[PDB]
Amino acid sequence: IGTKDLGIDLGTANTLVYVKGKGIVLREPSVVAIQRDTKQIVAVGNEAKNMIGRTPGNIVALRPMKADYETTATMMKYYIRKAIKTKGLFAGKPYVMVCVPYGITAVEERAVIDATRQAGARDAYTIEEPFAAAIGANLPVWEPTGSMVVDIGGGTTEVAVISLGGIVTSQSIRIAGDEMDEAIIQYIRKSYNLMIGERTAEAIKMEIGSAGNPEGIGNMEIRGRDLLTGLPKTIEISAEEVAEALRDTVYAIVESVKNTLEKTPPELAADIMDRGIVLTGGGALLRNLDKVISQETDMPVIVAENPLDCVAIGTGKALDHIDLFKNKARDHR
């Protein structure tokens, strides 16, 4: 009982490790450096970032979280080892709670667990990302009343209705932050014959992006490739245009919220109408998305406190409930 148990959120962009009794102790990019020819991972996280910055050549920089067995095991080994400052004398390895995407299958869950134990966990358990998000957002997930979370990440939006320590109904769509970026890229290509890159698209979304009602958000000067001449060009784009670019993405997200509500038992949907829907993840920060989802569902919608950290916090808080997740894993044997 001397080694502190761990919760790990291996996110698409950032990895966060929660240590029982200590909180978030590790905040590192979900990045790996591999040897360009032998495809071997030579650094992880901040160490990969530092090595990339020293440009030693013969290295390739990768974001492997969108994982295969050996990459998970290698990344887990690094993060577990780095987060644990001291070991127990009689049991030097932690129990580890691993955040996994919604809809993970049984065989996949056993593979994640195996990779985590290979990485040095005494034993390992999994928790679905929207359930971790609801726990970390402080929703009353253990009570017999309905709670709703909408976790908008990079590659997926997950919607879940929670009650009594479990997901009652849920939906996941592959429409999130990455797809907002792509919609912006495609709108600018079609409207201005201009090809922008990923950095500029993300910057546009962050600086003047919104889900609707973009009054006073402002305009931005952007640079990219004139598709006629192939030379770089600068134009000014408006928050109004960006809002129109993001419309189909936003309403796909709204549709997934509605579709989940439609599959939801009436009394749980009634509870949510009363307490409100909570948005988590980086995509929850899209200006006015809460207002748009609220307007389209006639339900209260709030952005969670600490929306970027909710999943990792909930993965750590799940350590006070290991019996539940123990039982969940034995279901998926």
Residue numbers in the entry: 4 to 69, 74 to 340
What sentences appear in the manuscript?
In vivo, MreB proteins form discrete, nanometer-long, membrane-associated polymeric assemblies along the cell cylinder that move processively around the rod circumference together with proteins of the cell wall (CW) elongation machinery, forming the so-called Rod complex. The current model is that self-aligned MreB filaments restrict the diffusion of CW biosynthetic proteins in the membrane and orient their motion to insert new peptidoglycan strands in radial hoops perpendicular to the long axis of the cell, promoting the cylindrical expansion of rod-shaped cells. We successfully purified a soluble form of MreB from the Gram-positive thermophilic Geobacillus stearothermophilus (MreBGs) and elucidated its crystal structure, confirming the classical actin/MreB fold and the presence of the small hydrophobic loop shown to mediate membrane binding in MreBTm and MreB5Sc. We also show that the interaction with lipids is mediated by electrostatic interactions and by two spatially close hydrophobic motifs in the MreBGs monomers that comprise the small hydrophobic loop and the N-terminal end.
The crystals belong to the monoclinic P21 space group and contain one molecule of MreBGs per asymmetric unit. Monomers of apo MreBGs display the canonical fold of actin-like proteins, characterized by four subdomains IA, IIA, IB and IIB. Subdomain IA (blue) of MreBGs is formed by residues 1–32, 66–145 and 315–347; subdomain IB (yellow) by residues 33–65; IIA (red) by residues 146–181 and 246–314 and IIB (green) by residues 182–245. Loop β6-α2, which connects subdomains IA and IB and closes the nucleotide-binding pocket, is partially disordered in apo MreBGs. In domain IA, the hydrophobic loop α2-β7, which has been shown to be involved in MreBTm membrane binding and is 2 residues longer in MreBGs, displays a distinct conformation, packed on the N-terminal extremity of the polypeptide chain. Crystal packing analysis revealed straight protofilaments characterized by a subunit repeat distance of 51 Å, similar to that observed in crystal structures of other actin homologs. However, because of the open conformation of MreBGs, domain IB interacts with domain IA and not with domain IIA as observed for example for MreBTm. We noticed that in the crystal structure of the apo form of MreBGs this short hydrophobic N-terminal sequence is in close proximity to loop α2-β7, which in MreBTm carries the hydrophobic residues L93 and F94 involved in membrane binding. Interestingly, analysis of the crystal structure of MreBGs also showed that a cluster of positively charged residues surrounds the protruding hydrophobic subdomain formed by the α2-β7 loop and the N-terminal sequence.
